[PDB]
Amino acid sequence: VHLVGEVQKVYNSQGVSIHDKHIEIIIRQMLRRVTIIESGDAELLPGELVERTKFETENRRVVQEGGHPASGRPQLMGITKASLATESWLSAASFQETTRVLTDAAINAKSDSLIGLKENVIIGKLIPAGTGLSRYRNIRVEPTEEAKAAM
Amino acid sequence: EGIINPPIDELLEATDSKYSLVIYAAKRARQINAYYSQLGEGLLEYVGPLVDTHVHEKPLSIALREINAGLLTSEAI
Amino acid sequence: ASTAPLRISFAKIKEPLEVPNLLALQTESFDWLLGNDAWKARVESALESGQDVPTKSG
Amino acid sequence: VLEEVIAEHPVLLNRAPTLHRLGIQAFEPQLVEGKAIQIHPLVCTAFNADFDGDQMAVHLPLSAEAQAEARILMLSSNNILKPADGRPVTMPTQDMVLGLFFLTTDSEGRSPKGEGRAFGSSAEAIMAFDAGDLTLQAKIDIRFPVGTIPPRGFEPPAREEGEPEWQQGDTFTLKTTLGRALFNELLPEDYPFVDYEVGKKQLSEIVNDLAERYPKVIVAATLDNLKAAGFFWATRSGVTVAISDIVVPDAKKEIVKGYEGQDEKVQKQYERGLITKEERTQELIAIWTKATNEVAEAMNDNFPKTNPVSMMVNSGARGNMMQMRQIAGMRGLVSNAKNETIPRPIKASFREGLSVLEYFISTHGARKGLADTALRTADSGYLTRRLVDVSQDVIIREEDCGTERGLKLPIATRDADGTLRKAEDVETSVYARMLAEDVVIDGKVIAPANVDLGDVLIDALVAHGVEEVKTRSILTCESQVGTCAMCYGRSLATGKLVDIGEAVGIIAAQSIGEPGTQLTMRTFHTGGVAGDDITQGLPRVVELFEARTPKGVAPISEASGRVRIEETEKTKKIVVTPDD
Amino acid sequence: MLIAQRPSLTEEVVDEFRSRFVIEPLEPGFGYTLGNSLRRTLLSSIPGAAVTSIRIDGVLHEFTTVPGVKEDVTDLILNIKQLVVSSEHDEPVVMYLRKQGPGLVTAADIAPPAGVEVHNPDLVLATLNGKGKLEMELTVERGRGYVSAVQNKQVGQEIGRIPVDSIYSPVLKVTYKVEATRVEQRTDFDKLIVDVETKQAMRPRDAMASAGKTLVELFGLARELNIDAEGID
Amino acid sequence: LIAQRPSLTEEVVDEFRSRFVIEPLEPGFGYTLGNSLRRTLLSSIPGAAVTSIRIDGVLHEFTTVPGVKEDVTDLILNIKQLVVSSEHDEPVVMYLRKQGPGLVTAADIAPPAGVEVHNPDLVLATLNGKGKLEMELTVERGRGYVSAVQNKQVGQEIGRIPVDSIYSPVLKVTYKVEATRVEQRTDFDKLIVDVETKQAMRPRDAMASAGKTLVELFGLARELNI
Amino acid sequence: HKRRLNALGPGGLSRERAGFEVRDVHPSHYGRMCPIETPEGPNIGLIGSLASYGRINPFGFIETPYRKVVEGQVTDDVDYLTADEEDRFVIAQANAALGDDMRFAEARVLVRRRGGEVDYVPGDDVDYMDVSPRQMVSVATAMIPFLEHDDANRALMGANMMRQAVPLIKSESPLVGTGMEYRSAADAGDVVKAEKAGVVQEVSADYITTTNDDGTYITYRLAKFSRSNQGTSVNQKVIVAEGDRIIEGQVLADGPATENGEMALGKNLLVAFMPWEGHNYEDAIILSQRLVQDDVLSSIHIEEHEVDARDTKLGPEEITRDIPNVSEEVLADLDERGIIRIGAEVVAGDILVGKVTPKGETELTPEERLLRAIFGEKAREVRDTSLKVPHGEIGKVIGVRVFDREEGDELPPGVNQLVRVYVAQKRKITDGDKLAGRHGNKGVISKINPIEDMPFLEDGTPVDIILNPLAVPSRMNPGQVLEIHLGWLASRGWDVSGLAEEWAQRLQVIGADKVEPGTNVATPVFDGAREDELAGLLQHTIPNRDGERMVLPSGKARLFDGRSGEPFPEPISVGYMYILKLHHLVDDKLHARSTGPYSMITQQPLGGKAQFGGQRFGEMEVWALEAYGAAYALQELLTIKSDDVTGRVKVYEAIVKGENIPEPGIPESFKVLIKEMQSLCLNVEVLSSDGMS
Ligand SMILES: [Mg+2]
Ligand SMILES: [Zn+2]
């Protein structure tokens, strides 16, 4: 609420009107990372950048094993840091720090799943947005029986 | 005599989506244009123009007119 | 006098000083560099007029 | 054979800045002579295009799929609504709005000929207007044929009837001018008779209603008719700019004389050393700001409705009141270098013409403004790119979630005594969203779940007496992959529910980054102290989105308790002691 | 010197009075001359007849109520001015209309004098309740064009007589537009489109023929000055 | 109610400038007739003007002739102002020749039969002692304006340069309406059309041609109906 | 250009290193640097122009003159003050009133002091007054009349476009303008001025021969239709008579864009400030065909492009006539040595000079071998790389220059023959040309109307240009309305004599009281004609016909219509504004690509107008296409139509044959990326679902 209200009070001061869902998308993409602590039983490093869904999956699999879950705090991070810290290293390589993330990928030997749009623009495949989705490209067309009966 | 002659909302209510509509009409137009390129080979799986045809127009016009007429359907694989 | 074509002026106030040469910024500087006859004429005119002027060519 | 080929084959037109989604619009080409691309005026404002040597590139969709996406997704008759706020953008304002204003305004200051005479139909009125005995704007009783829908306000005050009758499809008489009858001849027959001053804002509302309640081809036809008639009547509208049309207030002379007299009194008061230079400067800029506001009010009180400058600035056509204020009235206070204020303001108007040094101090502000807008558009592009990277790869990928959680967005706020008032910014916040659950006040649902919130439903809710609503926004949206269409809300570029697959992230990033050049904000004065003022304008936006600590830090107490100050001489200190 | 393509008028009909006329490609600059001259001679040169003044029994000029009829005198005036008549007397001739008792009165109830004929006996003029007492003597006078309400010392002779607007022209509205067409690789040829609306008494094509005839007669003044040459056919 | 046949009255205020009066016109009807006249007289009126020239010793219009104080393009500009009349349908070649110091004028041209210059006082060029000027001006009969790019048919003639021509001999056409002295509520208006043409032909003939064009077009409109 | 001051370059401040502080106008710039004119691009305020009166120290600081003041009695003495002495003194204005003597007419005068504070001081307290109110402005900015009514931004734009206007066929000096326009072209070196006073012996379009008083003979050779650096012609007209007197410094021959020794950039056009059917919507221009058929706005454009013959490894190419495998009609306009004739009309793709490549690699297919056997091919194997006119270019060959190694002319090493061919076209005004005024108003041209369609005045005079009046309140330059009013007054002169009014008396004492129709008027940049003078002169214009002046005292005139004929409802402002023709022309801005040259390091199409390039599809374009969701159009714009070597040729074949477009492959730039990353010891491998690739 505070972030949305601040940016909307900056924008409303001039007369430009922006709907608040456009801000809410960036804010949702902004608070996605969670910082964890005391991760002695979740067998990963404590006090780094952890994704929310991955952290929840780790919690589920460690309470399935019986171990106590590790604590975590949400981390409001900037657009640049959230852009660099992404799963697909092609998108982060196309951004500012293109030497650090290439070396980071080479050291970590990480291979990127091609879900995304910068990594599908570069290769030249169809982007997975709009017409490029799987549920739209998988249609088969044929005329009806009365149509070919007419001619 | 233009792009706007097929009414777009009729197509939307005939197919309930927009990107499915465009891939649908594009596939139909590709099939029609491949029919015109058969050079008299008589391939059975390639269907000609259903609606009445002028001597020179793009096959996408035939695709949009056919689907606006609503005599053609499809299914998802 | 008859140098310029007729142009009716709406100027209310007079100009005691006329606009100087528009190419002085180039020609005067390069004459200073060359030390030609024009530059030495200028330096002696300024010396007899008392104005400050470089006495050494470029 | 070229003319035979290029028909039914769309091309993509595109401007170099391409700030938002509408920078690429698929048109149908058409052979013309000359060496320039001929472009519809109705769409040039969506390009930010101005015909001052702007060069637009034309790209050709090539395969069947590319030109199909050009025809269906990209056409210029399907992009009425800007995705930034849902407002119409393909109804420009420079010339057609002025024509429709002149066509539909009220007869004030212009001699109304044939004022108050009945007319059988609009054809007879047109014949009378062509004869010359009836002016365009004159209150006349003009009868309308069967099928014309009456105005929204005229249905209940129907012509009184002895037997039961309905004025819904039947003929009727209206107290309206000829011009409003022509304007309703422009709009389609099913639209209610609009019976007011059009201007610009009401024209935007009309175009918004047309787009919301008519198919795309009908909306395109109606805006084309509006364009043609607006140009036709703006030719004959009686707008022009001679220097007699721009009028200075006659009271400005005596107002400036009195203020400079009291300024002279202050100046001889300062000459004795009784006041400092800084205090004198502060009070002088205060009183000169009072003077420029007062002469601006005098200028507003001076001009009539007939002169064309007011006719093109009060209609929403082109211009603001500040520009007319500093053409007719005094230019007011103008800034120095490094953002301060000269005690002596520019007392001369541009119609009167500035002096030498007044024009010099005007150049001080002008060059700083130009450099500011250059750096502003550079940083706006940088912020747009960063937002595009951070906000991409989020796409509507599910039809609907199984969730019911939402956000408690307020709907009624700042209600007075005995009445309820809706929120002022409802149009950008609650609108174009979806309710998480049904709302009941008396055991009956007012609004069903999973519907959009427009004008009528929000008005019904605020009339029934609700204070806050639960809107299903994207922050509460949990899903297996991405976000769903229903939790996102209806798309602002189509007017309907967002289709599955629409790349909402790039649209959001462009919509945030589009008005970055439009902010045009800089801190006017620091007040003589540095750090007291927080960042404003685009630096504030980028500081907010970068999650950085702002330059003015406001600490927040961790818990409730007792707080006291500790004024240590070297450095101040505050101490709060929470209870429990 | 010679015209590249000779034009030809074309008529498309959509209704018994609605008609739109399309002119085949004209020389550049001849679209708008023909359009405006034709519209102005169409609305204001065709002869016709219409009502000029009306007289209602037992009423006053300042008293806007008529007894036995539910609507005001302005509605009755507006209904009279929408009625079509054709006269050949070339002089103001009166027409009678009477009805007693309640009910509906139309133009069919008008008794037409010789030389004056009504063409639309279906439009309503007034409604009656209680006692009828409906007597008017409306003047029919031949005219040309459109003239507003005129006073010629008539209220002084009889106070029940009031002037009324007259639609003398047999056409209602003429809205023309000109669009460009491409012939022999040349886009600057004007295709004039004239849309004429007429009252149902006179067919629109006859009105256009009369307009063309009047234009031929009027511009024959400039032709007769000298025998010159110009490229045609 | 009154029907009066319109009558055109012609009066002169100068040799090639004369005013025309149409009195009994209908109300709100003289302005449009004046416009139709003005547009027909200003655009489509037959005439003749120089459409191609050739100067000995000159291969293109961008060079200069040895012995004239101004270049060839200024000569092109001066030729465009030269108004002539030609009854021949075929192109007619005039001749221009002048030697020695002096000032060549339009009168110094040598036109054949059926072609005459109507503004012989127009200055063309100025010749010094070493001035050579032989010039074969071509005149063609036409209407309106045609640019130089539409007047190229031969390429082997290197010395041939086509110019743009201004065929219409009408300078300006002006109309005005007044109030008729006859007393009716219709208030008829007399239309005063002010026509001023060049020296090619009298304004009476110009309006004769324009009226012929308009009466032919309006008769074409009338004839296909009934 | 010769008066600009640059802050960039070596030893200076770079554009990247610049900031807000350096670009700001300083209060010490008054009289030393122009605050208005400067490039408006990224380097705004880094490059400024010297002021009109600015001088240079022997040290190198920028000086400026001032009139010395002693005891309130200003003298005829001038001292040039640096940016240092201007602080310890107090500076008056040239606008301060004076009495019959040199004493101040008013004690209270508005002055400036140290730090640029504008606080006044009464009485005899000043010690230096300006020499002219035009001291702050440059030479380009001071050309504009009624600058004091314009905004500074539009003044910047107006001063920045007057350096872009082309010269026309015959130029006429502006009817209204600052009187310093003579000094801005007399001091230009392109206008021919007399070296010594004398009398003129003979005149010609090629030379002016003057016999001086002392008896020497000098001939001033005049450049005719030569090419400037930007391509515009620099022809020089003659204005002196056959035997008239010449004094020293007198203008003999006009330069480009000059009339009668006075400077003339554009034309005077009749302006009608009114919207006109939307063809002048959003800062566009409507203008008559009267500016096409009268050759008003047109210019000569000489374009130069050359080719040279060189002895390479295989052999030397020769310029010749026998072009292989071409029809004889194409080579109909060549000379014996392979040179196009002077004056030959050329079009796109035509031959100018015939150069034949001595040898190319010969790998003949059997099909081509049998075709050669059928037809018979010339025995010398040569390739057609002769010089041809580029696309979309027309002109007349006006001059050819041939250089030969075998002659005494110097040539670069390797080459043997060098030929230069000049082609000149007379570009007329058309759609898309960019026009502008002096006050920063500008716009492309949207419709060249016929003459009869224009709204004509009460006497049948059509307006030559139609402007949107919506521009002047928002753009905030009402000085051009003053300019059109004074242009109308300068067309039809005024007779003010004995009117016994304040403005009448001012015009009588100045000399602007008896003015013939058509004479040019002069408003200095800050001493111009006042509003009262314009209104009063509008009241007393000389009649033209019927003894009735045409423009009402309100400044507007009753303007008729051309298309409709009925009068427009209310009077529309008319006047004569100087209209410029910018060099941002439309005949060269047009550029299109189907399949042209390609870049070498990556297989994308290259760029540039002269190289048949393709328009760049930038990053925000791809963002917009993602936003539409049009995957296929974006994907084909990124793969099919560029940088797919197996895709472009197949797609061209499919289009020409008529079959459908094939499926796209992989862009070559991504393969370049993979090969680059694989060489930095990064094991970059692409693996599919089944396995590696
Ligand atoms: Mg622009
Ligand atoms: Zn959801």
**Which amino acid is present at G509?**
V
Strand F46-54, strand D172-176: pairing:
unpaired
* Separation CA F71–CA D391 (nearest Å): 67
Instruction: Tell me which residue has tokens 């750090």.
Output: D531
To which H or E segment does residue G263 belong?
Answer: strand G262-263
Stated resolution in angstroms: 3.7
Residue G333: DSSP 8-state: G
Strand ordering across the sheet containing F109-110: F109-110, F95-99, F132-135
**Which amino acid is present at E63?**
F
* Separation CA G173–CA C5 (nearest Å): 10
* Separation CA B72–CA B63 (nearest Å): 10
Q: Which among B17, G625, B11, B21 has a CA at the least distance from the CA of D497?
A: B17
Report residue G557 as tokens.
């005139």
Q: Does D529 touch chain F (CB under 8 A)?
A: no
C-alpha distances out from residue G222 to F75, G231, G527, Å:
18, 18, 37
With b for 16 or more beta-carbon neighbours within 10 A and e for fewer, the D51-70 pattern comes to: bbbbbbbebbbbbbbbbbbb
CB contact under 8 A, E74 and D118: yes
**Which amino acid is present at E72?**
D
Beta strands in chain A (DSSP E): 33-37, 49-51, 71-74, 139-143
Q: Is the dihedral of CA E53, E58, E64, E65 positive or negative?
A: negative
C-alpha distances out from residue B55 to B52, D5, D273, Å:
10, 12, 96
Q: Helix or strand or coil: residue D59?
A: strand
Report residue B46 as tokens.
């390639």
Asked if G292 and G374 count as a contact pair (C-beta separation under 8 A), the reply is no
Q: Which among A85, A94, A91, A70 has a CA at the least distance from the CA of A32?
A: A85
Q: Ligand 2 mean position to A25 CA, how many Å? A: 13
Q: Helix or strand or coil: residue G210?
A: strand
Phi, psi dihedrals of residue D409, rounded to the nearest 5°:
-80, 130
What counts of helices (H) and strands (E) characterise chain B?
A: 3, 1
Q: Using N-to-C axis directions, what is the helix angle for D538-545 and D356-391, rounded to 10°?
A: 20
Technique that determined the structure: cryo-EM
* Separation CA G32–CA G53 (nearest Å): 8
Q: Does E151 touch chain F (CB under 8 A)?
A: no
For the domain made up of D250-371, give the CATH fold.
Topoisomerase I; Chain A, domain 4 (1.10.132)
Asked if D396 and D458 count as a contact pair (C-beta separation under 8 A), the reply is no
Checking phi first, is residue D252 left (phi over 0); if not, alpha (psi -120 to 50) or beta?
A: alpha
* Separation CA G258–CA G181 (nearest Å): 10
CB contact under 8 A, D236 and G569: yes
Q: Does F182 touch chain G (CB under 8 A)?
A: no
* Separation CA G167–CA G255 (nearest Å): 10
Q: Does G563 touch chain E (CB under 8 A)?
A: yes
List all residues 6 or more positions away from D450 whose beta carbon is below 8 Å from its beta carbon.
D400, D434, D435, D486
Asked if B34 and G660 count as a contact pair (C-beta separation under 8 A), the reply is yes
Radius of gyration of chain G (CA): 33
Cα angle E45-E46-E51, degrees, rounded to a multiple of 5 = 105
Report residue D201 as tokens.
């804002």
Q: Which among G83, G78, G70 has a CA at the least distance from the CA of G114?
A: G83
Terminal alpha carbon distance of chain B:
35
Asked if D340 and D296 count as a contact pair (C-beta separation under 8 A), the reply is no
* Separation CA G663–CA G260 (nearest Å): 68
Asked if F217 and E19 count as a contact pair (C-beta separation under 8 A), the reply is no
Radius of gyration of chain D (CA): 29
Residue ranges per domain, chain B? Answer: 1-77
**Which amino acid is present at G540?**
H
Asked if G650 and G641 count as a contact pair (C-beta separation under 8 A), the reply is no
Phi, psi dihedrals of residue E112, rounded to the nearest 5°:
-90, 130
DSSP structure string for D108-120? SSS--SSTT-EES
Q: Give the neighbours of chain C: at least 3 Cβ pairs within 8 Å.
A: G
Q: Ligand 1 mean position to D98 CA, how many Å? A: 22
* Separation CA C52–CA C50 (nearest Å): 7
CB pairs under 8 A between E and G: 10
List all residues 6 or more positions away from E139 whose beta carbon is below 8 Å from its beta carbon.
E51, E52, E53, E54, E92, E93, E94, E95
CB contact under 8 A, G275 and D99: yes
* Separation CA D515–CA D368 (nearest Å): 20
Residue E191: DSSP 8-state: E
C-alpha distances out from residue A149 to A144, A145, B71, B72, B73, Å:
9, 6, 11, 12, 15
- Tell me the chain G residues in contact with residue D373 when contact means C-beta distances shorter than 8 Å: none
Q: Which among A143, D64, A139 has a CA at the least distance from the CA of B61?
A: D64
Report residue D252 as tokens.
């400005």
Q: Using N-to-C axis directions, what is the helix angle for B19-36 and B8-15, rounded to 10°?
A: 100
Residue E108: DSSP 8-state: G
Burial group, residue D209, by CB count within 10 angstroms (0-12, 13-18, 19+): middle
* Separation CA G628–CA F219 (nearest Å): 56
* Separation CA D18–CA D48 (nearest Å): 9
Q: Which among E130, D44, D271, D412 has a CA at the least distance from the CA of G120?
A: D271
* Separation CA G100–CA E155 (nearest Å): 76
Q: Does E187 touch chain D (CB under 8 A)?
A: yes
Strand G556-557, strand G318-319: pairing:
unpaired
Report residue G520 as tokens.
């040019």
Helix-strand-coil split of chain C, %, nearest 5:
40, 5, 55
Q: Is the dihedral of CA D273, D277, D278, D279 positive or negative?
A: positive
* Separation CA G64–CA E125 (nearest Å): 90
Q: Is the dihedral of CA G115, G119, G124, G129 positive or negative?
A: positive
**Which amino acid is present at E99?**
K
Terminal alpha carbon distance of chain D:
89
Q: Does D301 touch chain F (CB under 8 A)?
A: no
Strand D483-484, strand D396-398: pairing:
parallel
Report residue D428 as tokens.
């950008």
D477 known member of a binding site: yes
Strand ordering across the sheet containing G383-384: G318-319, G355-357, G383-384
Q: Ligand 1 mean position to D49 CA, how many Å? A: 6
Residue of D nearest to F187 (CA): D131
Strand E116-118, strand E161-163: pairing:
unpaired
List all residues 6 or more positions away from F51 whose beta carbon is below 8 Å from its beta carbon.
F91, F138, F139, F140, F142, F146, F151, F162, F163, F165
- Tell me the chain E residues in contact with residue F188 when contact means C-beta distances shorter than 8 Å: none
To which H or E segment does residue G388 belong?
Answer: strand G387-388
C-alpha distances out from residue A28 to A76, D475, F64, Å:
10, 6, 76
D401 known member of a binding site: yes
Most F-contacting residue of G225, G240, G292, G427 (CB-CB within 10 A), to test interface: G225
CB contact under 8 A, B37 and G632: no
Cα angle B60-B61-B63, degrees, rounded to a multiple of 5 = 60
Q: Ligand 1 mean position to D52 CA, how many Å? A: 5
* Separation CA A92–CA A118 (nearest Å): 9
Report residue E60 as tokens.
């006053």
Q: Is the dihedral of CA D196, D201, D205, D206 positive or negative?
A: positive
Beta strands in G429-481 (DSSP E): 434-436, 442-449, 465-467
Phi, psi dihedrals of residue F115, rounded to the nearest 5°:
-130, 130
Q: Which among G427, G170, G395, G433 has a CA at the least distance from the CA of G298?
A: G427
CATH of domain D95-237: 1.10.274.100
Q: Ligand 2 mean position to A131 CA, how many Å? A: 21
